[PDB]
Structure 1
Amino acid sequence: HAFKPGDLVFAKMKGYPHWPARIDDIADGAVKPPPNKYPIFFFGTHETAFLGPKDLFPYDKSKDKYGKPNKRKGFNEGLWEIQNNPHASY
């Protein structure tokens, strides 16, 4: 299974803990991601950034490892949104 819009993941950016997020559809006129990269929408903070699969972990199967709370800003809000309303627009 290649990643598709709507997929729920944890995403890793340098600097941050693995982060509740989802794969987004590309906006009509928006910048296209680099090769083998996706628009990742980060729950809680609502930022979007491009990432490849090496930093993308499926959410169901990785929650035990990554979905414990922490005081990084927006993180716990991000946990709430992925569990409760992951396909909302925010």
Structure 2
Amino acid sequence: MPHAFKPGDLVFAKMKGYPHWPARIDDIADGAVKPPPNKYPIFFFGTHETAFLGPKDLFPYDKSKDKYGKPNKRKGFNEGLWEIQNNPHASYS
């Protein structure tokens, strides 16, 4: 059975007006801005932007990749597909 989401989990993350986007659940570093309650810090591959999202917008990557892991015209998307598949746990700072 599924657990709750944890830092390092890989997902497609959905935001209004954007395609389901390869992403990971980030850690919060000591000293860093924490997310609102019930929200997770989401690191979007390719764009390397962070947003705060709740589980309703988080699709586990294994289950979802056949549907969502296809090239997209959007800036940063295909770079994001490479990252999630090839080095999803690297530092992209």
TM-score normalised by structure 1 residue count? 0.97
Deviations 1:8-37 (A, max 9, x none): 000001121000000000122222111110
Deviations 1:29-88 (A, max 9, x none): 222111110000000000111000000000011001111111100000000000000001
Query: What residue ranges of structure 2 are gaps of 5+ in the alignment?
Result: none
Q: 2:31 maps to what in 1?
A: 29
**Deviates further, 79-88 or 31-40:** 31-40
- Secondary structure at the aligned position of 2:36 is classed as coil
**Deviates further, 22-31 or 38-47:** 22-31
- Secondary structure at the aligned position of 1:41 is classed as strand
- Secondary structure at the aligned position of 1:60 is classed as helix
Q: Aligned pair count?
A: 90
Q: How does 1:1-90 map to 2 (within 5 A)?
A: 1-90=3-92
Following TM superposition, the consecutive aligned residue runs of length 4 or more in structure 1 with deviations greater than 4 angstroms are: none
Identity value in percent: 100
Name the Cα RMSD after superposition. 0.7
Query: What residue ranges of structure 1 are gaps of 5+ in the alignment?
Result: none
